Design a protein around this nucleic acid. Structure first.
Ligand code: MG
Lengths: 208, 465
DNA sequence: GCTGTGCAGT
RNA sequence: AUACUGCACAGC
């Protein structure tokens, strides 16, 4: 019910190089072109849903060893190390897609907003509160069940003094705000995150 | 995603009064293997104040305890003692020469505080010396209560584990110890905590406390299960087995394996298992064949020793995903034993997806939604019989993957472990969340850490519980 | 993802 | 160590 039906693209650009994922991000931050955050950490290959010909530099790999394949044969793969790599690539793609009005945690791994009421159009009652300090965040998790990939949604709060300074001892207050659920406080948050995600290389469906 | 609800299985005591409550079904029924009147002898260790309090508690609970029950008064009955209205059909007794006492000089020598190892092992030895004096005497106790005083409790609490070495030394004895803190025998001084320093530990109401402690004494003294788990529609003698991996306390990362069986009606057997190699985190101390084959062979050897037959179903359930070599070993051993029905499930205390939030009441205890391949088992919840949810916030499901699949589907597995949840012996509380072969893992590890070298390891869950 | 420790309410 | 449920932190 909280789970989210991702829809995969039809093409996957792959390459083979011998680089390392630190100096590669170093050159991609000191580059002079469009920066992208969905190119995957080099576990031996280079997988993305983007053409490297129109990228900033693409000096990680040489041009003649780039291939394009279909994502159906790669999404249905066993030997779950590749499944972990696919979840890695999907996490970087989601972090790059909704990257403008969002921030990614390093410890608790959530996507916090960065006061905005954020009213959204719905047929039910307008239950909108402060989202940008009591934030609203969620931890995305990728799981492939039966024939379909899926995102697991988990709401949480990220606390900050002024939006930039980190929290200090707001964890018991976060736990106390978590301990509040009467079948309205979680379904509304799931509805809000679905409405935000429905509005791009990954298409998000309707949760059950 | 198809949905269904489940009802809790009934409990049988004397083929009368099919009830779900383990307390009401003891109070007004005929408990299993009852008699006209039985005596259970208790033995107490500690200073004279603890012995006086223990005797006062034992001879005052027979008069009767109140049964107000502010939250669902069918959660517990008023305890009427073990007289005419005996819930266990017995009469407890304490022998005068059985109870022991240690002098103030030995306690002060323990409280000299050299470090937090030497005083601990000195108190351990002295306790087993008093227990050996108990055992070699004429007044042998069926169950021994270790009501250690507050000063020795603080000396132990200043930090190894006292409980592990105590149970390891008591495993070679003839009676199981029933360690109970001095706060639990109606003493006004509350025991200080560890981290919070100036704080008082909390405890339940007196009636439920007496119910739990007296049922635990009933099991640990009288060797007899109170409640059995009668099988579902079309079952046989199964071999529900859990596997746990523990790390010793001497700084060694050897994640050694164990094995626990809960085959017949709830009777448990704990077996040591094999050695431990090739664990970066710990997934395969069942490497290839050389461990798994003879671990399963020892499990079947214990089953042949007791039941003088072979199991019909084996339901190996754990919490860590297995590999191909371990699965090959399990399948080869079960084929060599001619096993009919098998399952190899790993159960997740994880999988953060929390669903079925609709309804005015919280979600009921027992509700299966079957994702296309894996199930979402809700084992803790609410009932209209209990009225509401007096627990905490939202419960936690489990998800079950039948890795290295077999001849069973997920509905049978979910119904089986929802039958398996409430056969708990440490508690008469109804709303339980974990299967007993999983919950027993920490309890057997905290004792089997300190056995050490090669001795008679034995097989009885009564020492660990 | 899974092993270790520590509380709070009934 | 009468308990069960739930919550937080650390390690790999
Ligand atoms: Mg116990």
């Amino acid at each position: 019910i909280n789970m989210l039906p991702l829809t995969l693209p039809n093409e996957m650009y792959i390459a083979s190089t011998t680089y390392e994922p630190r100096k590669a991000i170093a050159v991609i931050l000191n580059g002079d072109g469009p920066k992208r955050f969905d190119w995957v950490i080099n576990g031996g290959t280079f997988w993305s849903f983007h053409d490297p010909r129109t990228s900033a530099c693409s000096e990680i790999v040489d041009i003649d060893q780039v291939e394009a394949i279909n994502t159906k044969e790669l999404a249905l793969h066993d030997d779950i190390d590749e499944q972990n790599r696919f979840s890695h690539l999907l996490r970087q793609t989601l972090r790059y897609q909704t990257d403008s009005d969002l921030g990614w945690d390093k410890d608790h791994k959530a996507l916090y907003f960065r006061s905005r009421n954020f009213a959204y159009t719905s047929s039910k009652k307008k239950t909108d509160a402060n989202v940008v300090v009591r934030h609203h965040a969620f931890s995305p998790r990728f799981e492939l069940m039966a024939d379909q990939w899926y995102l697991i949604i988990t709401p949480t709060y990220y606390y900050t003094t002024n939006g930039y300074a980190p929290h200090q001892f707001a964890a018991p207050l976060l736990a106390g705000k978590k301990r509040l659920d009467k079948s309205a406080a979680l379904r509304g948050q799931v509805i809000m995150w679905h409405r935000f995600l429905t509005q791009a290389y990954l298409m998000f469906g309707e949760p059950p | 995603f198809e949905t269904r609800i489940f009802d809790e299985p009934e409990l049988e005591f004397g083929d009368h009064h099919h009830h779900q409550d383990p307390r009401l079904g003891l109070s007004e029924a005929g408990p299993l293997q009852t008699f006209l009147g039985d005596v259970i002898k208790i033995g107490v260790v500690g200073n004279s104040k603890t012995i006086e309090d223990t005797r006062k508690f034992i001879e005052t609970v027979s008069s009767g305890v109140e049964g107000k029950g502010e939250k669902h008064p069918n959660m517990h009955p008023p305890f009427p003692g073990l007289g005419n209205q005996s819930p266990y059909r017995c009469r407890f007794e304490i022998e005068d020469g059985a109870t022991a006492a240690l002098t103030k000089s030995k306690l002060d020598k323990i409280g000299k505080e050299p470090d937090h190892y030497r005083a601990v092992e000195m108190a351990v030895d002295e306790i087993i010396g008093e227990l050996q004096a108990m055992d070699d005497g004429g007044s042998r106790p069926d169950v021994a209560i270790i009501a250690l005083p507050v000063k020795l409790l603080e000396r132990v609490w200043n930090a190894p584990n006292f409980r592990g070495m105590l149970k390891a030394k008591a495993m070679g004895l003839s009676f199981p110890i029933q360690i109970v803190w001095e706060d639990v025998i109606d003493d006004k001084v509350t025991i200080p905590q560890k981290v919070k320093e100036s704080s008082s530990r909390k405890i339940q109401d007196i009636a439920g406390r007496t119910w739990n402690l007296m049922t635990s004494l009933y099991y640990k003294g009288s060797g007899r299960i109170p409640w059995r788990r009668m099988p579902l529609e079309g079952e046989f003698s199964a071999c529900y087995v859990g596997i746990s991996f523990y790390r010793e306390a001497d700084g060694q990362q050897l994640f050694t394996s164990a094995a626990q069986m809960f085959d017949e009606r709830g009777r448990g057997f704990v077996l040591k298992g094999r050695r431990a190699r090739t664990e970066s985190r710990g997934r395969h101390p069942y490497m290839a064949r050389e461990d798994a084959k003879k671990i399963i062979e020892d499990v079947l050897a214990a089953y042949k020793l007791h039941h003088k037959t072979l199991p019909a179903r084996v339901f190996i359930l754990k919490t860590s995903r297995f590999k191909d070599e371990e699965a090959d070993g399990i399948i080869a051993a079960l084929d060599e034993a001619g096993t009919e029905l098998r399952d190899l499930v790993w159960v997740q205390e994880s999988y953060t997806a929390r669903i079925l939030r609709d309804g005015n009441y919280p979600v009921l205890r027992g509700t299966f939604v079957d994702l296309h391949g894996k199930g979402l088992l809700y084992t803790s919840g609410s009932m209209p019989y209990y009225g509401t949810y007096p627990g905490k916030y939202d419960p936690n499901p489990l998800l079950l993957c039948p890795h290295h699949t077999s001849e069973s589907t997920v509905a049978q597995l979910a119904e089986e472990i929802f039958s398996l949840t409430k056969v708990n012996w440490n508690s008469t509380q109804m709303n339980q969340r974990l299967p007993i072969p999983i919950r027993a893992a920490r309890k057997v590890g905290e004792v089997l850490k300190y056995v050490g070298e090669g001795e008679v390891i034995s097989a009885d869950y009564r020492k660990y519980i």
